[PDB]
Amino acid sequence: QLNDTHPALSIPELMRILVDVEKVDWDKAWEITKKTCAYTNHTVLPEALERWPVSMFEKLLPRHLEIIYAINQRHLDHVAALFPGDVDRLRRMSVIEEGDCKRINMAHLCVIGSHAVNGVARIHSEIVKQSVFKDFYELEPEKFQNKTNGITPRRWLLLCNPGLADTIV
Amino acid sequence: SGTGNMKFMLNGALTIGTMDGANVEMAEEAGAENLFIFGLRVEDVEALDRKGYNAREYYDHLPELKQAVDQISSGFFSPKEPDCFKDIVNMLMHHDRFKVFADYEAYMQCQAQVDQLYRNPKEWTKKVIRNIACSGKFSSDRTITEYAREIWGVEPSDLQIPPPNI
Amino acid sequence: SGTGNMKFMLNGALTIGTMDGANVEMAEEAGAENLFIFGLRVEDVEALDRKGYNAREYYDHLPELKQAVDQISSGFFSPKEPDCFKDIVNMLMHHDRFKVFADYEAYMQCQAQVDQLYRNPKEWTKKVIRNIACSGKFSSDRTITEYAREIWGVEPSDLQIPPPNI
Ligand SMILES: *Cc1c(COP(=O)(O)O)cnc(C)c1O
Ligand SMILES: *Cc1c(COP(=O)(O)O)cnc(C)c1O
């Protein structure tokens, strides 16, 4: 479980260990990756989502960059098959963004490499589906879910408020 | 979402808030009348962006607010360094994306309703009991059981660890 | 001040500008009618801050501007990355301290007067001659003679270096 995009590198690193160390076939490793990983998003609006310049990846993680590029190409071939000639859909759905420098959208990488994607409240999860990852929702609605947050009743009642806990007991 | 919201609800506090995040599901669980919901709704915020937010109009025609902002600006709260909050005031009048002035009147009126309820101890605590009784949904046990069944494909209490050995 | 202003004036260019900095003394030297002065005056800028600047009202009721801003926003000038200028548009509508929209109409009208004068070559160049002839004040010789007499207490040409020896 990926609590935000901070552990997003789990997708290409699982792919790396399975394919380069464990000698598993690329396709098999990918179907294994998507089924093991799930992603939880905590933000609203797409500009808060984590991005890294590709140049930074070229230097620090050259093998993960290669894997990310391969994951993206295979993902856009699929999108191109389902929606032929839709050139702007390909740009929106791509994990790599163009601008003053090429950047890797880690959130897009999490969506593509996870079997499930959840928001943290009912309406936030609707925004996650319909706005933040609109195009991904159109392609795989079943991936997207809601898991309304919670607090532990032990710390946030039994520990901090034994008086109230007893009166209820 | 927010989780602090949930902590106050379980511990006997009433909530003054906007209709966003956890507050929405908290209202829906306990009934919105048991919560002090106020101010712009998500759609109202959008509609104010269509009109264009002019915070000056609020400062100009709300006397209690004008007095408060003038004190902050003139250095009443900072006598030795009277321009300490210049950037606060400049922001509230020209760059306030979070619509502080637009929600001030609604917030004041809402706090008065809070004041009138606290004035009656019994009806205050009755509303509290209604909040606590409807907070059960906001247990992380519920959230985790949800993740386990709908995402992880594991069942809780399928593993039963027996008493240990020393 | 500005010194680029002065460079164009000396080299045969007409000036489209606001009533601020060097433009003011340039107008006063050549007569304001020989310059394309437009838009908010210092006092008008202050008066707009008293009203509160709502850039949305300008975008909404100026069709040529709405079309231009929509193209910038929708990605007409950036087809491959249509959200490239999102922060430009967001700034012009909500955080524009420099009142770009507020001066657009006045600027357009002023550029039309520029267009009508360029359409008449002779009257264009007549106005140019009036600019060049009244630019003499903006010589750094004048500025430096001023510094020398009113600040440094030195007189220019009191030192006369004679021809050298090789
Ligand atoms: C519960 C808790 C939070 C979360 O507060 P929100 O504003 O609801 O996100 C933050 N800090 C501490 C110390 C908490 O116990
Ligand atoms: C004269 C000059 C300036 C000064 O321009 P202002 O906007 O009037 O300050 C700046 N850069 C260069 C290269 C100049 O020659």
Q: Which atom of ligand 2 is nearest to the CA of C3?
A: 8
Six-digit token string for C78: 């950036």
Q: Are B40 and B102 in contact (CB under 8 A)?
A: yes
Q: Do C53 and B54 count as a contact with CB atoms less than 8 A apart?
A: yes
CA-nearest of A113, C60, C28 to B49 is C60
- Residue C129: HSE in the Cβ half-sphere, 13 Å Cα cutoff: 6
Tell me how crowded residue A60 is: count the other CB atoms within 10 A of its CB. 10
For the residues of A18-51, what is the DSSP string, one character each? IIIIS---HHHHHHHHHHH-EEE---SSGGGS-E
Q: Which residues contact B81 (CB under 8 A, 6 or more apart)?
A: B75
User: Ligand 2 pocket: which of C1, C3, C139, C143 to mutate (most atoms <8 Å of CB)?
Assistant: C3
Phi first, then psi: give them for residue B11, nearest 5 degrees: -95, 10
Q: Do B50 and C56 count as a contact with CB atoms less than 8 A apart?
A: yes
Nearest chain A alpha carbon to C82: A88
- Distances from the Cα of B125 to the Cα of A74, A145, B34, B118, angstroms: 60, 36, 11, 9
Angle (nearest 5°) at CA C139 between C134 and C141: 140
Six-digit token string for A75: 């993902």
Q: Are B151 and A142 in contact (CB under 8 A)?
A: no
Q: Is B147 on the interface with A (CB under 8 A)?
A: yes
Residue nearest to atom 3 of ligand 2 (CA): C4
- Chains in touch with A (3+ beta-carbon pairs under 8 Å) read B, C
Closest ligand to residue B11's CA: 1
* Nearest chain C Cα distance for residue A162, angstroms: 49
Six-digit token string for C51: 């009203």
* Nearest chain B Cα distance for residue A131, angstroms: 15
Give the long-range contacts of residues C59-66, CB within 8 A, separation 24 or more: C59/C92, C59/C93, C59/C101, C62/C101, C62/C104, C62/C105, C64/C108, C65/C101, C65/C104
Six-digit token string for A167: 């009166």
Phi first, then psi: give them for residue B17, nearest 5 degrees: -160, 175
Q: Which amino acid is at C138?
A: F
**Whether the CB of C153 sits within 6 Å of ligand 2:** no
- Residue A163: HSE in the Cβ half-sphere, 13 Å Cα cutoff: 4
B3 Cα to the center of ligand 1, angstroms: 6
**Whether the CB of C7 sits within 6 Å of ligand 2:** yes
Specified resolution (Å):
2.5
